[PDB]
Amino acid sequence: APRKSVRWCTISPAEAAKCAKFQRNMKKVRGPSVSCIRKTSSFECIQAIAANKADAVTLDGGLVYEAGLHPYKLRPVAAEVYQTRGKPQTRYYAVAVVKKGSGFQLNQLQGVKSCHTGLGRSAGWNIPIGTLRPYLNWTGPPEPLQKAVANFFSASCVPCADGKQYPNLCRLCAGTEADKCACSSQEPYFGYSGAFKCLENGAGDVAFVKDSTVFENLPDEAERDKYELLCPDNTRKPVDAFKECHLARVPSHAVVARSVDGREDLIWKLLHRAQEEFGRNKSSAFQLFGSTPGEQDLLFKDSALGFVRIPSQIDSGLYLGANYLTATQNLRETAAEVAARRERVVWCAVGPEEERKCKQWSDVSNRKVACASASTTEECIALVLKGEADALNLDGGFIYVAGKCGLVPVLAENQKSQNSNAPDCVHRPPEGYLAVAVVRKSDADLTWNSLSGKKSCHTGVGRTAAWNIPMGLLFNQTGSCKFDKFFSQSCAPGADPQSSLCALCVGNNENENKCMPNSEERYYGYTGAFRCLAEKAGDVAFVKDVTVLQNTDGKNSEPWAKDLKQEDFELLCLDGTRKPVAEAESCHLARAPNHAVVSQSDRAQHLKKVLFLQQDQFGGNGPDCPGKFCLFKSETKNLLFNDNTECLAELQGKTTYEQYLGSEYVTSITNLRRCSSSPLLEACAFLRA
């Protein structure tokens, strides 16, 4: 038997008002239960939630950002969806309206009366001010943005703005006595609709509202045309025309709750039913997405198909997305820094081992490449999708993912084939390493059929290196998903600490990071992949050819395999035979795409560029290489970049993840995820949609 009530908080009184009905009505059907908590406004409302008293409630982009933060830390459980022409979406165009004829356009905005939905809201501020910013006569954050804005225009009415110190900004407002400039319904002109009025009534000459404002208000095609629409091309365009005309695009409004014990579960069901039982067009009793004539969008935006549950993992930053995220910091960050933050790179590291390395690179490159590391690799990706990163090397195994999260491949990795070896590589098309299986000269009582439940050595879960290919085969070999029981004891980082799969790991010296997919744990990756059956803890190992050769026979000083033999271990061919490590090529599971760098679509080129320089500085023939740092060098461990890799090269007419990895590798890995499902991916799936 579930829980109590969802104390949804409120801005205006009218807000508390219309809410109540909701409350009432609800009971009539007997589903969930709420309780409209009376309070100041959204902003304040936020705090209320972060101080038990409240929880559920919708917030505009701009807010959300502010929402999930230092002391509040609140995450959007669900975003509301809107149709309105086109198809159901969960994002919207940020635009600028005005009255027909006027004369100015985007840039000429200076010296006029504006209109803003509310101070802060992405819609009527963040983007607006942001896009205009360039020409403004302001520097960095210390000196309030308000001021800047304030005396850029002639005047205006920015609800939440401060009239105290600031004049104009709260001038054009229509608020009655002291009800003027209220960050809630009270002061009229607050909201998308209201703000529209601001211009309609002549006070303001330009309004910055939603891609579907007017429409809502002005039905009769007639009047409607009386106003035009501003497009960043420094010209005007028809109202309905916001596809190529619009300042920006932002994520839809979404209800936010607490990070932990914020009653997530509850909330969902609450809206869930309510948005079906009394959502849009349903019973007459109450109208969910429909506020009174008075003020519009109350509780939730006015007219919006319904809402959709945001995936557990999606966090503030994440949801808003980089695009937004980044042009929503300049307003709190100086002008100088911006530039810096732009041109320059931030590599994402995995495991402190790497972290340390990463660090080095900074000072050497003179900070040009700054750093930021995460725990799991997946964790690193996020950050890039969040923008806190910039880009990082990557296994193809996950490259799939990254791609699916939008980012794409930049340059790739070029090993070293002993032929006409030297510098060519830079453009020399990368072949790709090969998937093979290694056992011992001893235990020859094993074939690719005999395997069953031996001692599986995996570099890590869901990776080109090992896991992926074989596992694929295991599903093409057998139609069963359970790879857990399939093999008795093993070590495949990224899996359950108490699973047959992860099992056999060994953490650190002081037995720390155990099963942890990263440097620390000594059983993750290539190097560690051998240390499995090498010291005899593991059995058949899953690595590429070279692996063996980069340790056995004096190719690694570390205790364990400082003298093992190459001829010792064997490959476990497909038909069922065997081969030596020396003789690879024929006895090869398959060809594996090379690892590579990846970034945010837009942040490509530059990145690449920068990288080349650095690659020109301390790489294979890199002049300053051993004199300071050898980019690719990672004390026989393969940190950030591999170790064999001699250079970074482009992609022969293939920049999609479908193209780089090829339709074969690709379609397959999907099939492998049909069982084991990823959250990050899952996220992206909703996010990218």
Side-chain angles (χ1 to χ4, degrees):
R3 216 93 107 76
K4 242 141 213 60
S5 65
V6 186
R7 48 280 264 301
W8 195 294
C9 84
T10 56
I11 39 161
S12 104
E15 166 80 61
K18 189 256 206 98
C19 171
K21 308 158 198 207
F22 171 5
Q23 197 182 60
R24 185 176 264 126
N25 286 109
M26 230 48 216
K27 192 262 155 191
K28 179 203 77 182
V29 163
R30 107 180 83 204
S33 74
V34 269
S35 62
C36 328
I37 299 299
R38 50 193 96 194
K39 242 258 156 42
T40 314
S41 86
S42 39
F43 235 116
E44 208 136 328
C45 233
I46 301 170
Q47 278 105 17
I49 302 142
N52 164 99
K53 307 273 282 172
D55 20 78
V57 74
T58 324
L59 289 186
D60 156 285
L63 286 147
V64 205
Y65 159 60
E66 221 52 17
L69 246 170
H70 180 277
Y72 324 91
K73 271 277 162 57
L74 304 171
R75 93 101 175 192
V77 189
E80 40 183 290
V81 190
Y82 337 87
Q83 174 195 247
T84 311
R85 111 131 234 140
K87 61 182 161 90
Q89 297 213 219
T90 20
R91 264 193 157 221
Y92 58 83
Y93 307 73
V95 270
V97 206
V98 277
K99 199 156 246 123
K100 204 120 122 183
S102 303
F104 52 158
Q105 14 212 17
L106 204 84
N107 312 245
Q108 302 196 107
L109 262 276
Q110 141 88 91
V112 199
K113 303 146 174 132
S114 64
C115 304
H116 319 291
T117 68
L119 170 98
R121 291 153 80 85
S122 10
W125 187 272
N126 287 323
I127 305 299
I129 314 300
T131 323
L132 276 171
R133 199 239 173 112
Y135 27 45
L136 238 166
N137 218 91
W138 162 66
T139 43
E143 158 135 306
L145 182 66
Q146 331 215 19
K147 330 185 128 200
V149 185
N151 308 285
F152 161 104
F153 283 132
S154 298
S156 82
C157 178
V158 237
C160 332
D162 177 72
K164 187 150 114 64
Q165 297 103 25
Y166 314 73
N168 341 288
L169 296 181
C170 265
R171 182 180 156 167
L172 288 176
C173 295
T176 45
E177 301 282 52
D179 215 36
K180 199 218 225 182
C181 263
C183 200
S184 83
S185 283
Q186 283 297 96
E187 138 96 83
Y189 262 4
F190 143 106
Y192 296 116
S193 287
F196 176 95
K197 294 277 158 209
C198 164
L199 139 80
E200 195 185 14
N201 281 199
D205 295 82
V206 55
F208 303 134
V209 273
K210 193 216 244 61
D211 61 29
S212 29
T213 304
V214 193
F215 282 70
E216 301 170 282
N217 304 252
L218 289 196
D220 290 319
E221 182 141 75
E223 35 192 353
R224 267 217 283 144
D225 244 84
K226 298 199 192 124
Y227 319 85
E228 311 166 281
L229 216 156
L230 287 140
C231 329
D233 45 6
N234 318 298
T235 20
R236 351 268 292 273
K237 255 157 183 189
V239 192
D240 10 50
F242 53 110
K243 300 129 270 295
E244 308 128 52
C245 190
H246 69 261
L247 323 166
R249 188 143 159 223
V250 287
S252 91
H253 284 169
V255 177
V256 297
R258 258 159 279 113
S259 24
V260 275
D261 279 277
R263 282 111 179 149
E264 216 181 278
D265 208 6
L266 278 305
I267 288 165
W268 177 239
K269 266 198 191 87
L270 154 67
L271 294 158
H272 190 301
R273 321 273 284 287
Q275 80 110 264
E276 254 286 302
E277 256 298 346
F278 340 86
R280 197 148 107 102
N281 192 203
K282 321 302 185 157
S283 206
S284 28
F286 184 81
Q287 283 310 138
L288 205 59
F289 322 127
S291 313
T292 73
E295 297 108 307
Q296 275 286 294
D297 345 294
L298 280 161
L299 248 160
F300 345 82
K301 165 77 184 147
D302 251 55
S303 272
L305 247 299
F307 346 92
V308 271
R309 170 152 247 173
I310 300 179
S312 219
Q313 173 79 6
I314 299 186
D315 61 88
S316 61
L318 215 104
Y319 185 94
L320 311 154
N323 338 72
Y324 183 88
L325 244 299
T326 18
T328 319
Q329 240 100 55
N330 315 201
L331 304 162
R332 41 206 306 116
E333 303 284 29
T334 190
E337 286 171 74
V338 168
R341 170 66 185 92
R342 189 132 211 81
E343 148 254 285
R344 113 131 72 78
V345 194
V346 172
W347 213 280
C348 193
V350 178
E353 228 140 308
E354 289 203 25
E355 178 146 19
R356 303 175 300 125
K357 191 173 181 191
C358 210
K359 308 264 189 260
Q360 320 191 174
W361 197 1
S362 177
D363 44 293
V364 179
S365 79
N366 247 329
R367 285 228 158 215
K368 261 138 223 151
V369 186
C371 288
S373 80
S375 312
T376 165
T377 335
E378 322 239 10
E379 269 207 356
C380 248
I381 308 168
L383 305 148
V384 81
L385 271 126
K386 291 226 258 55
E388 302 190 32
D390 236 7
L392 55 31
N393 186 336
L394 229 161
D395 186 318
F398 288 103
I399 260 154
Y400 172 120
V401 160
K404 277 279 199 196
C405 291
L407 358 162
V408 269
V410 197
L411 11 83
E413 65 152 1
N414 246 355
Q415 35 211 323
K416 52 169 71 83
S417 237
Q418 309 97 264
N419 273 130
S420 75
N421 296 258
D424 205 343
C425 88
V426 192
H427 2 107
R428 197 229 295 105
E431 26 215 309
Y433 55 95
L434 297 147
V436 272
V438 266
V439 278
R440 308 112 171 275
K441 205 115 198 114
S442 179
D443 318 51
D445 295 58
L446 255 132
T447 187
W448 184 250
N449 296 84
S450 181
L451 17 77
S452 163
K454 276 296 172 318
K455 257 130 183 297
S456 4
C457 295
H458 284 77
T459 62
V461 299
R463 257 188 49 145
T464 310
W467 186 282
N468 258 328
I469 317 298
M471 283 306 169
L473 309 163
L474 290 160
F475 206 105
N476 225 87
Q477 273 259 293
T478 18
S480 193
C481 274
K482 220 210 284 148
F483 297 131
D484 183 285
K485 257 183 167 210
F486 221 154
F487 282 181
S488 81
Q489 265 235 78
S490 153
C491 177
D496 170 33
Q498 254 184 317
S499 74
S500 337
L501 294 164
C502 218
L504 255 159
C505 303
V506 82
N508 223 58
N509 17 285
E510 314 226 301
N511 205 265
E512 282 325 318
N513 290 198
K514 216 255 178 172
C515 253
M516 214 44 194
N518 78 112
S519 47
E520 312 240 286
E521 143 90 82
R522 257 155 344 224
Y523 260 42
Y524 163 86
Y526 292 133
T527 305
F530 233 8
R531 202 146 158 173
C532 189
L533 79 169
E535 327 228 41
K536 8 300 291 183
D539 213 325
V540 51
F542 279 126
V543 258
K544 56 163 187 206
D545 50 305
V546 212
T547 322
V548 190
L549 329 166
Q550 317 165 285
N551 43 253
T552 45
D553 281 75
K555 251 268 125 97
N556 176 258
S557 24
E558 271 109 276
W560 59 305
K562 60 151 187 172
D563 47 31
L564 273 175
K565 314 94 240 145
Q566 328 115 336
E567 186 102 345
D568 192 318
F569 323 79
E570 285 168 274
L571 323 175
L572 281 312
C573 330
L574 255 167
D575 74 305
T577 340
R578 250 156 128 134
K579 267 313 134 75
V581 178
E583 173 147 40
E585 329 253 349
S586 234
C587 186
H588 75 104
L589 290 170
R591 204 105 25 160
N594 267 147
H595 272 194
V597 185
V598 279
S599 200
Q600 263 311 338
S601 61
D602 56 292
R603 288 288 306 242
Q605 231 198 315
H606 191 282
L607 185 268
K608 178 188 270 215
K609 185 202 139 293
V610 195
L611 250 164
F612 275 135
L613 328 171
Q614 296 316 285
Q615 124 113 72
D616 275 51
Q617 195 136 5
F618 18 84
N621 317 108
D624 220 316
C625 212
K628 228 151 159 71
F629 160 56
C630 262
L631 208 43
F632 294 46
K633 276 295 164 225
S634 62
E635 300 110 306
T636 63
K637 260 170 267 127
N638 297 341
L639 303 162
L640 286 173
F641 305 140
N642 245 228
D643 254 325
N644 125 275
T645 324
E646 90 172 83
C647 75
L648 298 164
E650 328 215 320
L651 341 160
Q652 317 282 319
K654 42 190 182 170
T655 337
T656 341
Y657 65 93
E658 286 98 334
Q659 270 175 348
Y660 189 100
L661 314 162
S663 40
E664 51 183 310
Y665 192 0
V666 183
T667 318
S668 158
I669 308 325
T670 82
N671 287 189
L672 262 165
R673 195 240 53 218
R674 97 147 73 135
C675 324
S676 192
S677 277
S678 159
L680 191 139
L681 166 131
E682 239 217 311
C684 292
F686 157 65
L687 291 168
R688 287 292 298 195

